[PDB]
């Protein structure tokens, strides 16, 4: 359509490029915090060693063994790489990234005992002339992201130091620390977690997710040790968990005509950071992001024919798209799964006359989306940049009124912010989905106007919890939220409407398992 | 037929149960009101203070007439204490609580008949306690004619005012403490402590406390004043948001050079229960304008001359032959704004020619439909109306600032959520909280429901650059208790309601900002 469509700008890829890849950290220390006796660890512990081996090699989803197209990487200082017997070098099943200003990828290769091995481990060994940051940077490249599932900082006194301070600390998703109660090993380097509220912690609040019971090693000195997984507390996801909990403890009970019950409160707001490629996909329960992605893209394109979603295996619109339901809405003239002028149609053709989904609508009605894209690039402080699908005229003609019916954009310091207005909000499955959807829209719109993603604000109206969801939503409440993942684009397009779900990839999403 | 008919529960939805009052009292360093047998301390300054506060009216120009005067409530014992030759307290309605004395009884106790008749109007007895007295001053005879009620005494009455239900109605407490040389007392005055059950959620705070004064009564009596008020967290919601904006907002500049400090996304809640009217107290809100424009809105009016003809020129700038022409609205008579606000509320989508046309029946009447769903299916999650119509903004003098509102019904109370895109914290927001509270209250009256809560959601919240100094001044004032809204008479239809049908009682805002 070209002119009917919104042409992505040249900076399209400039304000969304992953600058630094997210990672985790594995480490062992003594009761005093020591980590290494200068070049060695005077305390090799069987259990801890197997743990490091398992943690760093295994992938999310059991039954999938590492391979060259999907594996984990480890980043280590040169002195650490040097402390590994050349015979066990490199650590198998992972991409070994070494920090060195004296050794090149080639040199590390030379170090391996024979040629054969040097060739057999060629794609598993690369040097980086820089510290952690330049390594995390190298990793974010198209070649390693999403290729490398998880990056693990396996250590080195200087790497751990770079990792625990801005900027690399803002990407540290988890800290796995093994504490061995050594009989005496007072080393040199102390590994310490910045305490909450101090300047060092840089605003981050590290809280345990899990702590193991004190254990006894099968080694020679029955050494005692324990494990701990530490994560950067997530206030953002907590807003959500707090609101669900309040609805369950204080919400009002209501049963509709169907006998469908719900607990609910009225009026609420949430904030979600969208900077540096941050996607707020909730962690205490996996979110259907492919479903989320396909539908948002479905929106911006002005679609109304749900079959396109159900063909790509997304069935969120079947119930409300059937013949039976449509007939109950008086839309007996609509093809099955032809919802009418809903969501997207009102976004790109407000007030246009609707007939059937396959008709030509180009140039019809007010294309709100195309004007907001144009105003942001010429008058970013305009206070009237908002779209609505809430059209009282077209409403009866719709399969049903839109739940997320209003959105507004704000600009400050080149950062695109978006406010959302959801009249009805199902906390259990609806709200998380909607948070992902609008987060995506702000990113895609940001990329189209030459701005950086900022924040997503969410205004809830009637936000409920189904009765049939109270218990499972209670189980979930137990879990403490983990760090959010990030989304990257593997390719850009010429027009906003051209983006496909595959063009982007969600990296480092470690959501808790399905509630039992 | 086009107008919204009021139900017969119209008056019951907002009947003023108890009228709001204040309490004046004197105590010694132990909290001794007196030895139950007359206050042993005549501290002249206190007497003139008492006389001044309880007699004068806010209108620093009106004299106490039976049509507009202050009331004074006291127990029989306190009324006896008043020298017969000085009964009743002149210039104030004397309200006496007694289970034996009668309106005629009190009267006869006064000597000469000349005053026994000139004061039949300023004396009245109530056979019951304080709670009954406030319920009696809430009748149409006293509210709003009585500008303010003053519980002036009796240990039994003070105790009642300090406990529910009467406390929830106490606007303030004036307490003078005397350095008592005589401890001859027995009953102690005590303001419930913050957080204790006795305080019933109310947190009493000092607005003012004087320095130690010395009476010219020849005894060197040391004494001091106090003005305690119920903490108004709700207005502090607004005071805080302004502080935050002024303190950390994004300074932007219009294309005309006009400056603003801003933040995007905020929310505020306001209780509309029991005739509570959330009119900020830190700066007087023009209620006569609010009320008239809202009414103007409900009627679906599009002609501002009708509002300017009532001393409300808020739309005179956008009603200019000049402004209008810029908008290309060349064929619009002056002051004809086009299909804005009200028009989209009652006629969404109708084609607009001139404010003269008859629109009855045209477009969608969002208000009607809500009022109906409200009385038959109060749980429906689609009770919201919008003024944001992209196909018709270009024909509007201006696009709506407060563009969307939704309703929610719980326990028979009506709540409302307002969405305002641009928000002038300096003048609009305060005005807009007023309007939508009024709107919510009237909607309740129209649907046999009780006013619940008003939720205010903001988009671009800003403080105009040249308002910093004034707002900073206002921020120094501790918010006072919100006033109450009442209704002298009712109506057969909602479009019929006139500004003079409701009265705003007990509104004691702080004086104008000394903007030198
Ligand atoms: N308890 C535990 O879990 C662990 C303990 N250890 C212990 O720690 C000690 C090793 O720590 P340490 O001596 O700090 O060694 P490291 O393993 O951190 O190696 C440091 C080396 O990494 C390189 N490097 C680091 N930062 C940069 C940078 N910004 N730019 C370029 N190169 C960089 C340099 O290589 P180059 O010299 O080539 O320029 C450098 O000398 C040992 O005693 C080991 O046993 C190690 C890992 C884990
Ligand atoms: N220092 C100060 O600031 C003040 C000092 N005082 C002094 O304190 C003393 C007040 O006496 P105290 O007994 O505490 O209180 P009151 O003066 O309130 O006298 C109580 C009397 O008020 C009436 N009353 C109270 N509650 C009810 C009710 N629910 N229904 C009907 N009638 C009711 C009764 O009249 P009845 O017996 O006829 O039924 C009752 O005996 C006085 O001596 C007065 O001078 C008073 C005010 C202020
Ligand atoms: C096994 C050990 C000591 N334990 C932990 N927790 N973390 C590490 N990074 N380790 C480690 C792994 C490999 C190398 Cl080369 C050095 C230390
Ligand atoms: C003047 C005095 C003592 N002082 C205060 N602060 N409050 C009262 N209510 N007073 C009072 C007024 C009238 C009567 Cl009859 C009794 C006490």
Give a list of the ligands: NADPH dihydro-nicotinamide-adenine-dinucleotide phosphate, the ligand CC1(C)N=C(N)N=C(N)N1c1ccc(Cl)cc1
CATH homologous group name of the largest domain in chain A: Thymidylate synthase/dCMP hydroxymethylase domain
How many beta-strand elements of chain A? 18
Radius of gyration of chain A: 26 Å
The coarse silhouette of chain A is globular
Protein name (chain A): Bifunctional dihydrofolate reductase-thymidylate synthase
Catalytic activity (chain A): (6S)-5,6,7,8-tetrahydrofolate + NADP(+) = 7,8-dihydrofolate + NADPH + H(+); dUMP + (6R)-5,10-methylene-5,6,7,8-tetrahydrofolate = 7,8-dihydrofolate + dTMP
EC number (chain A): 1.5.1.3, 2.1.1.45
Keywords (chain A): Methyltransferase, Multifunctional enzyme, NADP, Nucleotide biosynthesis, One-carbon metabolism, Oxidoreductase, Transferase
